């Protein structure tokens, strides 16, 4: 019994065998259906699928790639992994309430940002994929991301090469009217007693975070100019 979990694990192993990193077109016709497998599984497995994908990515992230083509294979393997994860999260309904994936999001902080932590061309594609992934995460687990941002702000306020990392994540967080207002309030009660570099980082995050809010929700922006919002006006 409990065999469905075994099959989910077998399909995960199928990913483990179809990866370009180890393999180096057998996993081209079936792998597409074998990846659509997990893509559909995320609609039902949800947390288990997320856990398997996160473990696979962390194993991908924790690599050596001493040679030359190994990095080339990883550049495609991790890209496909991120694309599949983003598609899975987008497909998964918001009613799943992936708050129990708090540990998974904490791992993704080192996994989805395995390349964007340092943030130093496949790096650009990985950055775009991670931005999409973080955007998908924000739609369900916004609370964990905001908590990480608030903890980073509190830690950096007390404290210097760079620490806007894990504090500039708002740059890719899906903004929302109320969410943007809360972010403005939190930054307002951080700004004065903050490092100048931290202030500039917050500013840079906020400008295109507002741009994100406008782009994603081009309805709240018109609502603000139609019906005034005193809280937003005061924060601004």
């Amino acid at each position: 019994a409990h065999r469905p979990v075994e099959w989910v694990q077998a399909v995960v192993s199928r990913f483990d065998e179809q990866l370009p990193i180890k393999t180096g077109t057998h996993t081209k016709v079936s792998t597409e259906h074998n990846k659509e497998c997990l893509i559909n599984i995320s609609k039902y497995k949800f947390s288990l699928v997320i856990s398997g994908l996160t473990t696979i990515l962390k194993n991908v992230n924790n690599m050596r790639i001493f040679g030359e083509a190994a990095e080339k294979n990883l550049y495609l393997s991790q890209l496909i992994i991120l694309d599949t994860l983003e598609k899975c999260l987008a497909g998964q309904p918001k009613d799943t309430m992936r708050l129990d994936e708090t540990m998974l999001v904490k791992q993704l902080l080192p996994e989805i940002c395995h390349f964007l932590h340092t943030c130093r061309q496949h790096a650009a594609e990985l950055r775009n994929s991670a931005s999409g992934v973080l955007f998908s995460l924000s739609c369900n687990n916004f609370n964990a991301v905001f908590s990480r941002i608030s903890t980073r702000l509190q830690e950096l306020t007390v404290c210097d090469n760079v620490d806007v990392h894990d504090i500039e994540l708002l740059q890719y967080i899906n903004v929302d009217c109320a969410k943007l207002k809360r972010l403005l309030k939190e930054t307002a009660f951080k700004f004065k007693a903050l490092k100048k570099v931290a202030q500039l980082a917050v500013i840079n995050s906020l400008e295109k975070a507002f741009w994100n809010w406008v782009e994603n929700y081009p309805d709240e922006f018109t609502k603000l100019y139609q019906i005034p919002q005193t809280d937003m006006a005061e924060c601004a």
Binding site: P4, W7, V8, V29, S30, H33, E36, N40
Partner: peptide, 26 residues
């Protein structure tokens, strides 16, 4: 299913297996 899902590479055959696994997970 476990043996086939690990080695068998016929997406025509794998498709019904995938659909079955999906309903099992449901």
């Amino acid at each position: 299913i476990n043996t086939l899902l690990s080695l068998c590479q016929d997406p025509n055959l794998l498709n019904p297996i995938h659909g079955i696994v999906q309903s099992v997970v449901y």
